[PDB]
Amino acid sequence: EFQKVVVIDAKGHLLGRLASVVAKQLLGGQKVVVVRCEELNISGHFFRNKLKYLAYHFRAPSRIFQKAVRGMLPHKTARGQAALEHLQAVEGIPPPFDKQKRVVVPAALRVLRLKPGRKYCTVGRLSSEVGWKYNDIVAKLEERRKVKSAAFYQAKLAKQKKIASAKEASPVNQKLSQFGY
Amino acid sequence: DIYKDETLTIPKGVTVDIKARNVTVTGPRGTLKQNLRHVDIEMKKQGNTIKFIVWHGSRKHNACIRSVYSIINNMIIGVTQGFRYKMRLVYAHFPININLTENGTVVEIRNFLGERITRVIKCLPGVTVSIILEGNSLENVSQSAANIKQICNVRNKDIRKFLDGIYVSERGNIE
Amino acid sequence: FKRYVEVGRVVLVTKGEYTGKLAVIVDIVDHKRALIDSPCSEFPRQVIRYGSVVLTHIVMKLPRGARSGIVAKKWKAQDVCNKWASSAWAKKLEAKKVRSQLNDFDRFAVMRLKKQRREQVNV
Amino acid sequence: ALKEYQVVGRKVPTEHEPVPKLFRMRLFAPNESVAKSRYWYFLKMINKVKKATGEIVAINEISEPKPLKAKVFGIWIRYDSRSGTHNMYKEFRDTTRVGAVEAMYADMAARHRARFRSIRILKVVEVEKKEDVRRNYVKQLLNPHLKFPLPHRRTKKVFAPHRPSTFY
Amino acid sequence: AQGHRLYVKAKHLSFQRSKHVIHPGTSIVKIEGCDSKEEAQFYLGKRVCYVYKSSKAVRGSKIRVIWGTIARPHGNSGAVRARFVHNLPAKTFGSSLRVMLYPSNI
RNA sequence: UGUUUAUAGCCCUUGUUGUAAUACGUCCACUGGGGACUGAGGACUGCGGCUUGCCAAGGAUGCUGACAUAAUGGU
RNA sequence: CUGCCGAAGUUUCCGGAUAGCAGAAACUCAGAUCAGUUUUAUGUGUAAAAUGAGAGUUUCUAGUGGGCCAUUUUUGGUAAGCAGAACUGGCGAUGCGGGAUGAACCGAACGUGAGGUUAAGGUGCCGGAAUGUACGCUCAUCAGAAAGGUGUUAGUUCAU
RNA sequence: GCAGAUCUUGGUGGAAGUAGC
RNA sequence: GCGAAACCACAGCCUGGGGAACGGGCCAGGCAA
RNA sequence: AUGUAUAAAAAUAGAGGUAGGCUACUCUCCUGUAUCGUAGAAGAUGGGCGAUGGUUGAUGAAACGGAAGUGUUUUAUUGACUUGUCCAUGAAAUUCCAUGAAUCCAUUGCAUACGACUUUA
Known about the structure:
Number of domains of chain B: 2
Oligomer: part of a larger assembly
Organism (chain E): Schizosaccharomyces pombe (strain 972 / ATCC 24843)
Number of helices of chain B: 2
Structural class of chain B: alpha+beta
Strand order of the largest sheet of chain B: 11-12-7-13
Order of helices and strands of chain B: EEEEEEHEEEEEEHE
Helix content of chain B: 10-25%
GO molecular function, one term (chain E): structural constituent of ribosome
Strand content of chain B: 35-45%
Number of helices of chain C: 3
Largest sheet of chain B: 4 strands, antiparallel
Radius of gyration of chain C: 19 Å
Shape of chain C: elongated
Distance between the termini of chain C: 41 Å
Largest sheet of chain C: 5 strands, antiparallel
Shape of chain B: elongated
Number of strands of chain B: 13
GO cellular component, one term (chain E): cytosolic large ribosomal subunit
Subcellular location (chain E): Cytoplasm
GO biological process, one term (chain E): cytoplasmic translation
Number of strands of chain C: 5
Largest interface: C-D, 23 and 17 residues
Distance between the termini of chain B: 40 Å
Order of helices and strands of chain C: EEEEEHHH
Radius of gyration of chain B: 20 Å
Helix content of chain C: 25-40%
């Protein structure tokens, strides 16, 4: 299934694997928005990736994730230039996308790709000492949004419980249960 | 080894909860919270028994299991009887003045080999120094002792000739 | 944990020619292989890889290296059937299997029942 | 797709040697043609019998007599390294003798980067006694307390909506 | 506006090509729900179409359609090879192609 | 722990139905569908089968439509 | 302007005459001879079976009448490399697929087209094609695509 | 029967409104 | 206000590698307004 | 464009819910092929029945939503619709696919390759 707008949560996702699936999707004429890019993960411990950046200048993981894709797409080709603008990488979950579903990519999930006991690095933690100086405010927004979202979930859960009780109380439900519904 | 297990006996502490990989060991001395998320080791709690299980772990993981068991044992001992360390000051000509502030949380050292600059060392949480320092965390006491020794250090001075300084005399259990 | 590799544990095949069928592990071969058999005669006693299998909560007691006849006797004795099906997990699988077999006409009946189902909306 | 092929061969009879001796050995080959070629090379190494000097009399594949019963197999192999002279002996637990053989070839090809030509299968035997088992890993697989969670779970339908549970 | 859509959405990926040589006679189409070569057999023979609009009003309308036909599958991920009456423009990469259900074999 | 079918049984050996079945390998002048690209040739022969006629046998013919009073086309 | 054939690129004696390659003609034969052929066998050569192809002459006439690379063979070498002769192919008269790109490497040698399938090489993205399956090994804090190591991985052997 | 010959003849640009007067 | 001559295949960001220079064109790149 | 439909967090090596007084519980996971919506001449005419509810449109604003709040509800009333259960007509020969301020300006020296700059006007 593909949509005109797709929101992908970057928490617990490998950078390269996430970059690959979005690179193909972007060439497919699809708009993809990436949120919480600061919580991306890269195989290899913290010092190695720190040395990698020291050899390498954009401090935003949203820019870094965009930069990784930029060299992973035909940038010279005008088609690649057009597809670049269809990708929107932002840190955290902004209000224009907080009230929308956030899907995940199985091919990039750390739990499905990383062996237990393997060291890994977090981009937001990595970027904190390279020029980024907004971790507190970015974090502060995260708990504020999730607290509001959790309250929304509780209201939705209560509504789901009420309708579920109403659904079971409905005699119509088991009239034609032979269809598996 | 596909499966390896290490068994330990829980002390008479009130709480031996290890939920969310955090050991909230609450005993008669006090309640101490420890984090063990560094090593992914399976834990089994059954009454007064705590079992550390490693499922096909590597040698480094196997080594950390023994280290985690020692850490758990040390935490249990501290929460039951506590850890007390005693240090004896050594001076040759100019005595070193030691001042305790905030119930021993702050230690000021003056006239250390004649030095006119006072060194202030902040004790670790849960450890009180009166020099004998007592606390429920052995690691906190050890780190504080190292900091005190580091503060009372002679720079560009003969170690064999000038024996002035602070050294830990003994360390044991409070109870 | 709740699922561990033990002799007698019932497993469900998720990938292969016997997808959706249940089986019981009889012996452990290696860290990646196991020999299993099923009460259904259509499933022959074959060794399967741990990747193509899933672990279920229900566990049954069987001797090591039990024969197929004894396992079937053991399965009937312990009533393994209708025990896994009692769990809601099997119920979802039964519903999904039936739903995939629904025809076009039955879909319209599903639509009519669903519309009548939403007619309650009373709390 | 290895399969254990038995090969029997003898030298060409002549007035000097009217009755040739029968030489039979069991080797694992993916097909009959590979088995016959390997047999000639083995005989040249040992008995120095050329292909023209001899001829194969019977080729036959051997199935596992009890393929449904788990067993332990010990193989003696001589392997060619930088020195060109090495010997090893390994044990594996599997339900098929071919399955044990192909398992060792993968292990040899990984640990020592071993080629099919370099490897020569010296000895094959069945391990049955508990005290006969020597390797530690198979020893851990022998005690009746074998119980552990499934390792390497990780279980195109891209863009899964929910987070995977990845538990029981 | 629930209804309509007697077809299945599909995306026009690219042309049949080597690493550097492209043959634009046939184009790769990725149909939704198709994820294996054995599955793409069902869509072999269907009539695919490219629908686009233009400023000029021709016959009183504003829609131009380039018909086509699925021919063979392309790889193990459900892609198909579709030949059109007019070869698709190279600009329509990553667009929408409507795979209607005729000629039906079911 | 040690123990020998018990208040689980297993394994091995025969015995064991049998000509078990499956799998593998190979053949069918066995058969049933899906899809694509081609129509070169221009009476008659020939070679075959069915039974003079007929046919899938020495290369495409039918049924239809719409467009034409634009579609297909070219620059 | 198109079509067909198309070398030689060097022996050998000695600026040349030869030759050779390519042609052009005239001849006689396929029941006749042959082959950068392979066998059989007699003593590597020679002689007599298969596999193929029709084979042999005479005349007269254009062009060439360099090399580079690679393989090998040797001799010495000579700091060490290497050099020196050869040996045989390929390019040179030859485009295309691959090798990131790149004249020597891997494939394959070319009328204009349609379909089909491949070779070498590839299937994460750029990039056409599985983020295939099974099994291990690799942790690098410069990976990866002589040795030392409180470096591991599997371990082997010997001691208790 | 032309694309070349620092080709012959004629024409015409950039340089350039430049060097400048 | 009056007004040349010289020159001119065509151009003009580099980074590297591209085996024969290759940078002035090729591929990887960034740049490119 | 063709349903242009969908909001928890968080573990994943245990999480969530469920319930009891953080301590003892239980249940679900093992995805979305899920769920919601999708019935009518693009959805007709009326007759009802049945809800007497639901679906919404129209406006009258209330709060929430700083971030990029610009959208989430709450509704107040009204307008319709209602295939929720049903009927009776109706919808076609296209009789096989193609669809007003500010700048220059004056002032200005606080400037000064030249603009700029600089107040005033």
